[PDB]
Coordinates of N, CA and C in Angstrom, one line a residue:
Chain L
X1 N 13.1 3.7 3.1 CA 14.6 3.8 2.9 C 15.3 2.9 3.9
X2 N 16.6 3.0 3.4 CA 17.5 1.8 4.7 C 17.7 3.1 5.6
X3 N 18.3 2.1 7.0 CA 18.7 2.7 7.9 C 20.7 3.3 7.4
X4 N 20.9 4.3 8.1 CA 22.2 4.8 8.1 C 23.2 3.9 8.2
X5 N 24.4 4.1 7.9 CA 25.5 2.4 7.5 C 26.9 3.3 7.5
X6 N 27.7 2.5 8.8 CA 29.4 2.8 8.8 C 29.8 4.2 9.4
X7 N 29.4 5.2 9.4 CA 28.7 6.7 9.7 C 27.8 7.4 9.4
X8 N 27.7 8.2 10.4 CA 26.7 9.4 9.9 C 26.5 10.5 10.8
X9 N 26.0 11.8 10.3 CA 26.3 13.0 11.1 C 25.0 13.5 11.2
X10 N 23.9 13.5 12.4 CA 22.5 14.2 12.2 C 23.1 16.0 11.7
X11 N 22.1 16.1 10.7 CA 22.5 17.9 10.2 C 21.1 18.3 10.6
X12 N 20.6 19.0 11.0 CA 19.1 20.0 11.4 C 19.6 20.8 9.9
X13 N 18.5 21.8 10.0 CA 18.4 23.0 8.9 C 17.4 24.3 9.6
X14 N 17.7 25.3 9.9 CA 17.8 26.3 10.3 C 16.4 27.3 9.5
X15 N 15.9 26.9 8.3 CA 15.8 27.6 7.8 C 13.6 27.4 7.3
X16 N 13.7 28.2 7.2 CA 11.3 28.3 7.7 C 11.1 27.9 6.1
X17 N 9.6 27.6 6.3 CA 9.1 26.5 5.2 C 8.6 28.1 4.5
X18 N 8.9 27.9 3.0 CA 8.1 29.4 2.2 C 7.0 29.7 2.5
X19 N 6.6 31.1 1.8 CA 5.7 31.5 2.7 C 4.0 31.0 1.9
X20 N 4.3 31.0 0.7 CA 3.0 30.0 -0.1 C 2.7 28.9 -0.3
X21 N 3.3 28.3 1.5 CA 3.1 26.8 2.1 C 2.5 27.8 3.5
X22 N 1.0 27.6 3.8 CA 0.7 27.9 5.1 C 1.2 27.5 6.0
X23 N 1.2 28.1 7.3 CA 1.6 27.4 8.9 C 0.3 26.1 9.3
X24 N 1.1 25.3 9.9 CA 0.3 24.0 10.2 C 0.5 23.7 11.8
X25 N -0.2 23.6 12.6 CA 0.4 23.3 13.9 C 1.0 21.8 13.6
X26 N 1.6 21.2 14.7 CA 2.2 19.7 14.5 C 0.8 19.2 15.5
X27 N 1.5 17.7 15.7 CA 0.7 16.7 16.5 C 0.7 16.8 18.1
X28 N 2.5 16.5 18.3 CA 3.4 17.1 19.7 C 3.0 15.8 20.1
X29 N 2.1 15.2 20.2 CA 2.4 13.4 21.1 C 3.3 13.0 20.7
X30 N 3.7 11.9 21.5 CA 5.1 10.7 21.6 C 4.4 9.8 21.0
X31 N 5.3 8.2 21.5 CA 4.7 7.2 20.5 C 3.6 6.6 21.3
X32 N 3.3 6.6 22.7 CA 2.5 5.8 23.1 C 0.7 6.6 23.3
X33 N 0.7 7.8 23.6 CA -0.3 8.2 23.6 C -0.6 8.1 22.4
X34 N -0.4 8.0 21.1 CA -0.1 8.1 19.6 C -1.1 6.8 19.3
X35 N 0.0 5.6 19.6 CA -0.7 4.5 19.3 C -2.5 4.1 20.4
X36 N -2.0 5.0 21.3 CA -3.9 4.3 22.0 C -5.0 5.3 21.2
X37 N -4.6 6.6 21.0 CA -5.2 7.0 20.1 C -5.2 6.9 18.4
X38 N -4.8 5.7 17.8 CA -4.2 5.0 16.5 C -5.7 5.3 16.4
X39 N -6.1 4.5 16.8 CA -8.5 3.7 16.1 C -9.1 4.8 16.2
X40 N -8.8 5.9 17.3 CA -10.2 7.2 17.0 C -9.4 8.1 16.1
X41 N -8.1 7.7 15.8 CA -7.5 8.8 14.8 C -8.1 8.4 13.0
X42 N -8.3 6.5 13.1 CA -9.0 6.4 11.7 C -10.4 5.8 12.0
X43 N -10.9 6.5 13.0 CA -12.6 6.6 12.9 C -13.1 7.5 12.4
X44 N -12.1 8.9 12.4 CA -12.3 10.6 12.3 C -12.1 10.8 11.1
X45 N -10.4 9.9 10.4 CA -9.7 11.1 9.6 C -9.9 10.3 8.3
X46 N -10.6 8.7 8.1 CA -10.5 7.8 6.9 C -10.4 9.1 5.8
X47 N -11.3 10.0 5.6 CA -11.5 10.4 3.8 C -10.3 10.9 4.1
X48 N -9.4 11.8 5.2 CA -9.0 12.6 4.7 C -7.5 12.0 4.8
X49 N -7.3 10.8 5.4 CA -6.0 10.5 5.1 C -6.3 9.5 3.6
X50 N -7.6 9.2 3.3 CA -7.2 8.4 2.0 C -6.7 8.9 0.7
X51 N -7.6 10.4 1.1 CA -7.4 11.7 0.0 C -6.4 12.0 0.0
X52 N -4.9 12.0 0.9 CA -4.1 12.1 1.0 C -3.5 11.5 0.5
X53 N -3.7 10.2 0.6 CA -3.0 9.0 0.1 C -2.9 9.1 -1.2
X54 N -4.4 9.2 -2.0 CA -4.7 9.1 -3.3 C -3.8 10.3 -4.2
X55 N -3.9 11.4 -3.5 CA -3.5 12.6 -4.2 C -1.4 12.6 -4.3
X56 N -1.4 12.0 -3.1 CA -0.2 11.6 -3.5 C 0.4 10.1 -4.9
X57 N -0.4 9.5 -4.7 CA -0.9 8.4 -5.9 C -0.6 8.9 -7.3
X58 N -1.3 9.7 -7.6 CA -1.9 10.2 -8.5 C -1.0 11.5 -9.0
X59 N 0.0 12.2 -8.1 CA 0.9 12.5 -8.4 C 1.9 11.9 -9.2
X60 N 2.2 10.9 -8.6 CA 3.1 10.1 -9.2 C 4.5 11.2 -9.4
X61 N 4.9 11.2 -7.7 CA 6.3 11.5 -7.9 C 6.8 13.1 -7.0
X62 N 5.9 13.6 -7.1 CA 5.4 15.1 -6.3 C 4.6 15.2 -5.1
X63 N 4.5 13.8 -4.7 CA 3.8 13.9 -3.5 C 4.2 14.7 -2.3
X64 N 5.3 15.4 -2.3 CA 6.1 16.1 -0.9 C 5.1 17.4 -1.4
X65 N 5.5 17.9 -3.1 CA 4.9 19.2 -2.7 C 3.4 19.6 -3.2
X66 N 3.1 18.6 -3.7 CA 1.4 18.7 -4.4 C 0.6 18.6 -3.3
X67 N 0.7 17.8 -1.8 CA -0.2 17.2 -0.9 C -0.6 17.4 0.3
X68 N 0.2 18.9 0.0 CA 0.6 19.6 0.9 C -0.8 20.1 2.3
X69 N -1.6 20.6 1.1 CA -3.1 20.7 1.7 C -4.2 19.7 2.2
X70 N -3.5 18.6 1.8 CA -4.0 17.3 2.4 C -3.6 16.7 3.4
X71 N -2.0 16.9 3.7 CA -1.6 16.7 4.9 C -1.5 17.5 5.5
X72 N -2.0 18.5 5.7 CA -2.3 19.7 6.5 C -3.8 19.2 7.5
X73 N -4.9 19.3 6.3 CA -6.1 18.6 6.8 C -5.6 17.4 8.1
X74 N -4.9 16.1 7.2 CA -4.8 15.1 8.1 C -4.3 15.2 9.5
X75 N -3.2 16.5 9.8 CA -3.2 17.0 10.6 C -3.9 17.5 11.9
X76 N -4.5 18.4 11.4 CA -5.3 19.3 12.1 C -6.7 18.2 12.5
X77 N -7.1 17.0 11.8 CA -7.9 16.2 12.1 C -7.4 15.2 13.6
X78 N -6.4 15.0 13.6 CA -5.3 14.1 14.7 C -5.1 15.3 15.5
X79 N -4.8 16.5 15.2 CA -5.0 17.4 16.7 C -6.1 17.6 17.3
X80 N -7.2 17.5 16.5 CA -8.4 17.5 17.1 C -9.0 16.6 18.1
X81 N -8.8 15.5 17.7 CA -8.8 14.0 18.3 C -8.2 14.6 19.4
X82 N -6.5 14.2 19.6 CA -6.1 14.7 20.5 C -6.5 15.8 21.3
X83 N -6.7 16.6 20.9 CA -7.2 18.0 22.0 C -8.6 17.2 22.7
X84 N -9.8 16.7 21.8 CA -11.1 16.3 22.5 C -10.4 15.2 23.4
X85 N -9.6 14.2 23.3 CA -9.0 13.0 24.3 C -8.7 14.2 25.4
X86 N -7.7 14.8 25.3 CA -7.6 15.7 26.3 C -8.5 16.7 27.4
X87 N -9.2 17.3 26.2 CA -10.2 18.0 27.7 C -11.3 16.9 27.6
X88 N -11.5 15.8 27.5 CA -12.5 14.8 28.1 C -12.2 13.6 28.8
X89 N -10.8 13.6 28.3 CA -10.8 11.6 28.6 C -9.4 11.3 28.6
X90 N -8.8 12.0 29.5 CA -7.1 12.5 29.8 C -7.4 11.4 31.1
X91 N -7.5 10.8 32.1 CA -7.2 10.2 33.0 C -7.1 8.8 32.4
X92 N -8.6 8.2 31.7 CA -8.0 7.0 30.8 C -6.9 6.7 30.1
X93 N -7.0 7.7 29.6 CA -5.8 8.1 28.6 C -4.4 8.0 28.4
X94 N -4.3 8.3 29.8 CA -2.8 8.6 30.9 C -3.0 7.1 31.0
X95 N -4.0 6.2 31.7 CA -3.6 5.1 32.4 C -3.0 4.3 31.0
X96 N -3.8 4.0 29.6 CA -3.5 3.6 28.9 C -1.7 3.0 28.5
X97 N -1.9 4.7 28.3 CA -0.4 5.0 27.9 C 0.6 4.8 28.4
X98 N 0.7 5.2 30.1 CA 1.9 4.7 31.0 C 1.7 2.8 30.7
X99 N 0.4 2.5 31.1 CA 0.3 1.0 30.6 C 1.1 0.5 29.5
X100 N 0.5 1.5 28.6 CA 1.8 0.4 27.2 C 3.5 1.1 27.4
X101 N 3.4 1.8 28.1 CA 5.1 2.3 28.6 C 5.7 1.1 29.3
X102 N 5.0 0.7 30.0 CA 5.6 -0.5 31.1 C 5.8 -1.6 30.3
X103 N 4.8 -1.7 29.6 CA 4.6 -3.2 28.3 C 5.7 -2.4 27.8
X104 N 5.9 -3.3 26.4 CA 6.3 -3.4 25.1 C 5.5 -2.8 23.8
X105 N 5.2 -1.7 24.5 CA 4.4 -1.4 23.4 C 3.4 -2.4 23.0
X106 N 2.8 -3.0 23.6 CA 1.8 -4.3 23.3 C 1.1 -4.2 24.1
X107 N -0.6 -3.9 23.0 CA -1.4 -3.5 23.2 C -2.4 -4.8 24.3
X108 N -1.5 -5.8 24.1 CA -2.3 -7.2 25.2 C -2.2 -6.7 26.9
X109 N -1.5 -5.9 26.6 CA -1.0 -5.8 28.2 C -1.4 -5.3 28.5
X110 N -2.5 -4.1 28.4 CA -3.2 -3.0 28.7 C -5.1 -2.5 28.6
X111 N -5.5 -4.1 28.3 CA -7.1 -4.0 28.2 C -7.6 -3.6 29.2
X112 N -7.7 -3.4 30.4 CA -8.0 -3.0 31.2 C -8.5 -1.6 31.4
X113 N -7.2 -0.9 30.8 CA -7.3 0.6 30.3 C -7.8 0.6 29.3
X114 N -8.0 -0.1 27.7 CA -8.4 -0.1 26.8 C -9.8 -0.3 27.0
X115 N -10.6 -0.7 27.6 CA -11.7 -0.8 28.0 C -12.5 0.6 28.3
X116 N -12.0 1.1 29.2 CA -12.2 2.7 30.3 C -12.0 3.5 29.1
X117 N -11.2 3.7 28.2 CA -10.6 4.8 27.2 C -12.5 4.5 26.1
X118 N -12.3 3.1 26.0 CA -13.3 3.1 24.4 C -14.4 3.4 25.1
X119 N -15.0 3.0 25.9 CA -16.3 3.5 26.7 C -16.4 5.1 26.7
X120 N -15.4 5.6 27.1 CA -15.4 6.7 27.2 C -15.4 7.6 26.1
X121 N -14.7 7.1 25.4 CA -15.0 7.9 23.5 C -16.1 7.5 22.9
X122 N -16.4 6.0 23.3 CA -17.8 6.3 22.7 C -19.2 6.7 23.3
X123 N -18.5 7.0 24.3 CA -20.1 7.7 24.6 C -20.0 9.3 25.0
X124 N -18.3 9.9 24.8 CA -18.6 11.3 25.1 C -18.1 12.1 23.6
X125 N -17.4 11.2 22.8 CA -17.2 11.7 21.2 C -17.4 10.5 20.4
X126 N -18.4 9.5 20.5 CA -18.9 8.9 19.1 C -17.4 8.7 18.5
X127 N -16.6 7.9 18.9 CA -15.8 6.8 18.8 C -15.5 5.5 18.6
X128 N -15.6 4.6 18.1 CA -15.6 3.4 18.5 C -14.0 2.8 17.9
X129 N -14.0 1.5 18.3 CA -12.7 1.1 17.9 C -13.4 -0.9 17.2
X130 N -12.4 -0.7 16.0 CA -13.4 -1.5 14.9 C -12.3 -1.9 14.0
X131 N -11.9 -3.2 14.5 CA -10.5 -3.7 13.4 C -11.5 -4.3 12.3
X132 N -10.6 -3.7 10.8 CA -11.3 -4.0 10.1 C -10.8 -5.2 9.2
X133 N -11.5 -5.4 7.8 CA -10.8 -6.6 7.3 C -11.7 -8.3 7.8
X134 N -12.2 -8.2 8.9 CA -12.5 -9.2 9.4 C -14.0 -9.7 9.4
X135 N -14.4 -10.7 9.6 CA -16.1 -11.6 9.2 C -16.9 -11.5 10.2
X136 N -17.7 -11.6 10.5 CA -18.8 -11.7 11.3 C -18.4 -13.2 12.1
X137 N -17.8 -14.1 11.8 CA -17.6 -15.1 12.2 C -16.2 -14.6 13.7
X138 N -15.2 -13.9 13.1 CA -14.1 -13.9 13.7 C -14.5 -12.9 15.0
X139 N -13.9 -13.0 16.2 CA -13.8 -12.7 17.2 C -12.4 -11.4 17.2
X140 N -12.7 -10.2 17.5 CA -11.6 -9.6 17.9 C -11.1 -9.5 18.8
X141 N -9.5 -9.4 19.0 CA -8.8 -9.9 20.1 C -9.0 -9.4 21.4
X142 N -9.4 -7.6 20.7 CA -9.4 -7.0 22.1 C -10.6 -7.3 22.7
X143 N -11.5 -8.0 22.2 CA -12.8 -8.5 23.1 C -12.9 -9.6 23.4
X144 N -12.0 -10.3 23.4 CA -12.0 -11.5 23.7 C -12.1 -11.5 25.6
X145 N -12.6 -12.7 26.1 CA -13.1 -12.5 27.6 C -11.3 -13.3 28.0
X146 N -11.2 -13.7 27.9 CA -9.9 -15.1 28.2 C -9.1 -15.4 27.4
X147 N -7.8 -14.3 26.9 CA -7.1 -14.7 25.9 C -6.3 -15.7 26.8
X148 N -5.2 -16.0 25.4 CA -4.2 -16.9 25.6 C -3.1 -15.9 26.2
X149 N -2.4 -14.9 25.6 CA -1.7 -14.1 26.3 C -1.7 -12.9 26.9
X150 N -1.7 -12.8 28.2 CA -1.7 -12.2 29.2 C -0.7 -11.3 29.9
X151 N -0.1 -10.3 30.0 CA 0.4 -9.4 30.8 C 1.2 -10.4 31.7
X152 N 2.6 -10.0 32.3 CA 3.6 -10.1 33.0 C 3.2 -10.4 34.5
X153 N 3.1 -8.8 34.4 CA 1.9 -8.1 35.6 C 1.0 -6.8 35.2
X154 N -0.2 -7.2 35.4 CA -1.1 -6.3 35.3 C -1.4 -5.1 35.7
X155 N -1.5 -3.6 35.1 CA -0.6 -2.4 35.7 C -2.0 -2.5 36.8
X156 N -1.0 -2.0 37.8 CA -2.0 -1.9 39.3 C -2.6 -0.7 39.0
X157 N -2.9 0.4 38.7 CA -3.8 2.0 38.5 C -4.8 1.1 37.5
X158 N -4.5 0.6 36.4 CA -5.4 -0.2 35.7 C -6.6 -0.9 36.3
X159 N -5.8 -1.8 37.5 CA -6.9 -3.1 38.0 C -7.6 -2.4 39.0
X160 N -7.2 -1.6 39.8 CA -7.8 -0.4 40.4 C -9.3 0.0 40.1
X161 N -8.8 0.5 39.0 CA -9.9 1.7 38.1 C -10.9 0.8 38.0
X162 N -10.4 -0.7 36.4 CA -11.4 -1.4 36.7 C -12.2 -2.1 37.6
X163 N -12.1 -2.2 38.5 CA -12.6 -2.6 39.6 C -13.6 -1.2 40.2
X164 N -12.9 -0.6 40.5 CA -14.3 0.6 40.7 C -15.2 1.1 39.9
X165 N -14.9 0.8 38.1 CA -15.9 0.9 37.6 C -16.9 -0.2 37.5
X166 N -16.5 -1.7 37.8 CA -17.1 -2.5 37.8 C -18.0 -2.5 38.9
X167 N -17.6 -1.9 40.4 CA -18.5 -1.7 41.3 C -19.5 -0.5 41.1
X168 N -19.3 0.3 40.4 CA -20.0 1.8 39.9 C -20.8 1.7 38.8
X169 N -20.7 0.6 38.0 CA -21.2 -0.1 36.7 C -21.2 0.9 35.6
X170 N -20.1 1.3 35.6 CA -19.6 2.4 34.3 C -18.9 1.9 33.4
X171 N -19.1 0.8 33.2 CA -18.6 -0.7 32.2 C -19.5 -1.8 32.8
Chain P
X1 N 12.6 -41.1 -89.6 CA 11.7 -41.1 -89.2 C 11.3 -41.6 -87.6
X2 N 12.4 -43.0 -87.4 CA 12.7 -42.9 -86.1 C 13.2 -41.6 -84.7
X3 N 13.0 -40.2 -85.2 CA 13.4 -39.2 -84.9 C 12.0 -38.6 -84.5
X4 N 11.1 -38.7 -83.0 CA 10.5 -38.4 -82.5 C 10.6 -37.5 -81.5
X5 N 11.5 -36.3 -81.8 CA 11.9 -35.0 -80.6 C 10.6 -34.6 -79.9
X6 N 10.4 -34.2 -78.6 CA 9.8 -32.9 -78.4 C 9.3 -31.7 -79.1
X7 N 8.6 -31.7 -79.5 CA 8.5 -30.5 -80.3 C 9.1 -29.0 -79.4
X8 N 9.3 -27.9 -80.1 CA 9.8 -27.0 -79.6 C 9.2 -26.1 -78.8
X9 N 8.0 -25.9 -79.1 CA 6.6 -25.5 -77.5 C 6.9 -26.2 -76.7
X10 N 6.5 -27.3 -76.8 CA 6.6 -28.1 -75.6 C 7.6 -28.2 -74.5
X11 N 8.7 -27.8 -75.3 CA 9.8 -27.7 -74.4 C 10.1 -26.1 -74.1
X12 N 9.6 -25.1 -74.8 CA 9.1 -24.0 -74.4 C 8.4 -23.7 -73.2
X13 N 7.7 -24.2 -73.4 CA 6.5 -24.7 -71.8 C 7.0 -24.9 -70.8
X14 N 7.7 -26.1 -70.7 CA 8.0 -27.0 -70.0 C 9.1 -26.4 -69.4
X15 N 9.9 -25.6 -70.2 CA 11.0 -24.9 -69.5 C 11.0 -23.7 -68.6
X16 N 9.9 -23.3 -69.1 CA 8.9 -21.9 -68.4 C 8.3 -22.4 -67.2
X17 N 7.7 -23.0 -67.2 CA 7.1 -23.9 -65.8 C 8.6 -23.7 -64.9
X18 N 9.6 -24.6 -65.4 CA 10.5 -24.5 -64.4 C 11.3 -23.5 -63.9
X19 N 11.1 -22.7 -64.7 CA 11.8 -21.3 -64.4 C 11.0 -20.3 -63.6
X20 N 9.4 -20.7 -63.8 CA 8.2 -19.8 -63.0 C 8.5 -20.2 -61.7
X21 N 8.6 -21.4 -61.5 CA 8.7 -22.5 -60.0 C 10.1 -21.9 -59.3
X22 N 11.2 -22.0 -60.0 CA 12.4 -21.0 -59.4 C 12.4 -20.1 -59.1
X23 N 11.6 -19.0 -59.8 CA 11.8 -17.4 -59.4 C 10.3 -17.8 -58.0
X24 N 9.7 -18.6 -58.0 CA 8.5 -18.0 -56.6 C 9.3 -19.0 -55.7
X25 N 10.2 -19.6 -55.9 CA 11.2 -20.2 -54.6 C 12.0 -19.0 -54.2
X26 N 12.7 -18.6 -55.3 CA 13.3 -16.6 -55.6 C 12.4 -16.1 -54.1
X27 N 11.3 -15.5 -54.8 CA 10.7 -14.7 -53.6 C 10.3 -15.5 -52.6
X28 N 10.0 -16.3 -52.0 CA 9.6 -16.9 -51.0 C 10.9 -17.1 -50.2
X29 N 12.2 -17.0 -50.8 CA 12.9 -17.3 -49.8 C 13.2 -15.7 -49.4
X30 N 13.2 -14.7 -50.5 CA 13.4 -13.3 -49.9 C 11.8 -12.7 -49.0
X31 N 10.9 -13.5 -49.4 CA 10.0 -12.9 -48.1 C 9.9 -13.4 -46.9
X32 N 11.1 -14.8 -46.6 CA 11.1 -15.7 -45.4 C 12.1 -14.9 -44.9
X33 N 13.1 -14.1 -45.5 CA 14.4 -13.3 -44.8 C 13.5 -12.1 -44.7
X34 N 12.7 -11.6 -44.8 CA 12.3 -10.5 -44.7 C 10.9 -10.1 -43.5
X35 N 10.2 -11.5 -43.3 CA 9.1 -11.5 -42.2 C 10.4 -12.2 -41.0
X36 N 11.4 -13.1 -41.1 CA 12.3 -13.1 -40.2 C 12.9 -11.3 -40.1
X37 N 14.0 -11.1 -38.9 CA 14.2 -9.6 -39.0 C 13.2 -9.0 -39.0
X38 N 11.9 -8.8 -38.6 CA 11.2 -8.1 -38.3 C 10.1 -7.8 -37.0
X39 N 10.2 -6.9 -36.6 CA 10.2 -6.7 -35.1 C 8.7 -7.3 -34.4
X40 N 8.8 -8.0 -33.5 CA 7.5 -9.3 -33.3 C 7.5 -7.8 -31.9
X41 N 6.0 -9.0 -32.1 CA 5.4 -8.2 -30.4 C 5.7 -8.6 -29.2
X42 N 6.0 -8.1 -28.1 CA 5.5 -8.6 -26.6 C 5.2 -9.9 -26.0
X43 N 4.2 -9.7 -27.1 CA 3.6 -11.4 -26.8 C 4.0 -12.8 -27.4
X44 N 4.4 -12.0 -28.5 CA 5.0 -13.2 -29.7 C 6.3 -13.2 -29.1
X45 N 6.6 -12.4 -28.6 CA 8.6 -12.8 -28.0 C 9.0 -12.9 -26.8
X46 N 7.9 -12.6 -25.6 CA 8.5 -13.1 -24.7 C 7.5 -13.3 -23.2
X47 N 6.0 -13.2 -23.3 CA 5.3 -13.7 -22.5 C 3.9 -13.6 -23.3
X48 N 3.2 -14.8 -23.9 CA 1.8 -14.5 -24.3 C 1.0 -14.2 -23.7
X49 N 0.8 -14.5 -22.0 CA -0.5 -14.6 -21.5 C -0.5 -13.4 -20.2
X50 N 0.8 -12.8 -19.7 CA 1.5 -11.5 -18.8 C 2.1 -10.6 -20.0
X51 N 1.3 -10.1 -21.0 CA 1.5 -9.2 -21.9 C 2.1 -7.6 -21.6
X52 N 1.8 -7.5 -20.2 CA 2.2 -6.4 -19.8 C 3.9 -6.0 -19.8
X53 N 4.7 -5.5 -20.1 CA 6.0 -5.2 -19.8 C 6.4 -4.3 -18.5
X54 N 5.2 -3.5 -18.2 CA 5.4 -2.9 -17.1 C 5.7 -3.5 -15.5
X55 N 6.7 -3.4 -15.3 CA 7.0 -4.3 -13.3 C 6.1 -3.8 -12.7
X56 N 5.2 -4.6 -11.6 CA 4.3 -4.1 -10.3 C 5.5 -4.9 -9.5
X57 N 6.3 -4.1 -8.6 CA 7.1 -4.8 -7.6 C 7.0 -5.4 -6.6
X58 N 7.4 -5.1 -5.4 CA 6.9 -5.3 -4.3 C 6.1 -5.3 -3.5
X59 N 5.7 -5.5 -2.5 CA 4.0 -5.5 -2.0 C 4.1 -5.4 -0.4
X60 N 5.1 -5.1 0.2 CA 4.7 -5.2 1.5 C 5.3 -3.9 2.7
X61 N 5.8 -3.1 1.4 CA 5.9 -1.8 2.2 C 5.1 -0.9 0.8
X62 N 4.3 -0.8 0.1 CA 4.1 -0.4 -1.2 C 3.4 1.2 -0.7
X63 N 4.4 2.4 -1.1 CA 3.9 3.5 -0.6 C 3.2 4.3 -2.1
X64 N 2.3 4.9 -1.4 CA 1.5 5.8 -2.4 C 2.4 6.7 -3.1
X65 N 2.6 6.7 -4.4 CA 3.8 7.8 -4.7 C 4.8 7.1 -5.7
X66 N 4.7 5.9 -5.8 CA 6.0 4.9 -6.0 C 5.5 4.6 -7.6
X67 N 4.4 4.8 -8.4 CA 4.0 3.9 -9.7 C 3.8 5.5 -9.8
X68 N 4.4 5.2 -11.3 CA 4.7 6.5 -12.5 C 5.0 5.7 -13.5
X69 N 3.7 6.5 -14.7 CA 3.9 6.4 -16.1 C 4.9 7.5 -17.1

């Protein structure tokens, strides 16, 4: 939909979802811990957000209230993620995220931390991070040794860390 | 004796013929008004080879939910 035009008045609503719609917890992240956890959110949840997708498809038109148990699922699969990031891999995590705070939301500015985070999901929850779409020929960005664009300045807690894990050989 | 007419079959005939040839000009022009005015297809009227009528829109925000029959 368009954005709001000439005025507009935010209205809340006051009032609880019926009762033969079960309770769902929410997500509760912002946008940056959100986005570093984007790749282990669709390494986890592919069937169950496509089932979501589809079933809203396939509605054709009732997707708010037919999909309901799908987005529920989708849910509860992204808090899960989240909660295991949290009791395992919350220090990476943190660096990431304050990292893309300082950026622009742009994920170039922050490999450093993206490095320490994927190591760490994939070896203490079978995670990996896997752009798809692409050939056996093509190089992904985030692996690349020597991109073209590079960070402003490089978050210092980042170059830190890496560096002691480079001396520690935990990468 | 110089009075060598057509005989009167002949021109019986002959006038029947042209009268048969007028009435199937008759119907052929009322079944040319009549296959005209009559409702063509899809394909015959306005795309032969994108026979579909149905619009697929847009493509670059395209959310699940949006195509209904």
């Amino acid at each position: 939909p368009r954005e709001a035009a000439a005025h507009w008045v935010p209205f809340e609503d006051k009032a609880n979802m019926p009762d033969n719609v079960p309770d769902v917890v929410e997500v509760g992240a912002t946008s940056a811990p959100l986005l570093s956890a984007s790749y282990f959110i669709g390494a986890k949840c592919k069937p169950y957000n496509d089932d979501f997708m589809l079933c809203r498809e396939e509605s054709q038109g009732s997707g708010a209230i037919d999909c309901l148990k799908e987005g529920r699922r989708v849910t509860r699969c992204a808090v899960s993620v989240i909660e295991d990031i949290n009791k395992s891999c919350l220090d990476e995590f943190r660096l990431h995220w304050q990292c893309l705070e300082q950026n622009n939301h742009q994920l170039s500015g922050c490999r450093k931390a993206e490095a320490l985070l994927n190591k760490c999901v994939f070896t203490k929850l079978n995670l990996e991070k896997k752009i798809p779409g692409l050939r056996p020929d093509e190089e992904p960005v985030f692996l690349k040794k020597d991109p073209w664009i590079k960070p402003a300045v490089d978050d210092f807690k980042s170059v830190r860390a890496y560096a002691e894990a480079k001396k520690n050989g935990t990468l | 004796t110089f009075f060598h007419p057509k005989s009167r079959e002949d021109i019986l005939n002959e006038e029947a013929k042209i009268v048969q040839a007028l009435n199937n000009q008759r119907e052929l022009t009322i079944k040319m008004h009549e296959l005209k005015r009559e409702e063509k297809d899809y394909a015959h009227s306005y795309s032969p080879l994108f026979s579909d009528p149905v619009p697929q829109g847009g493509s670059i925000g395209k959310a699940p939910g949006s195509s209904r029959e």
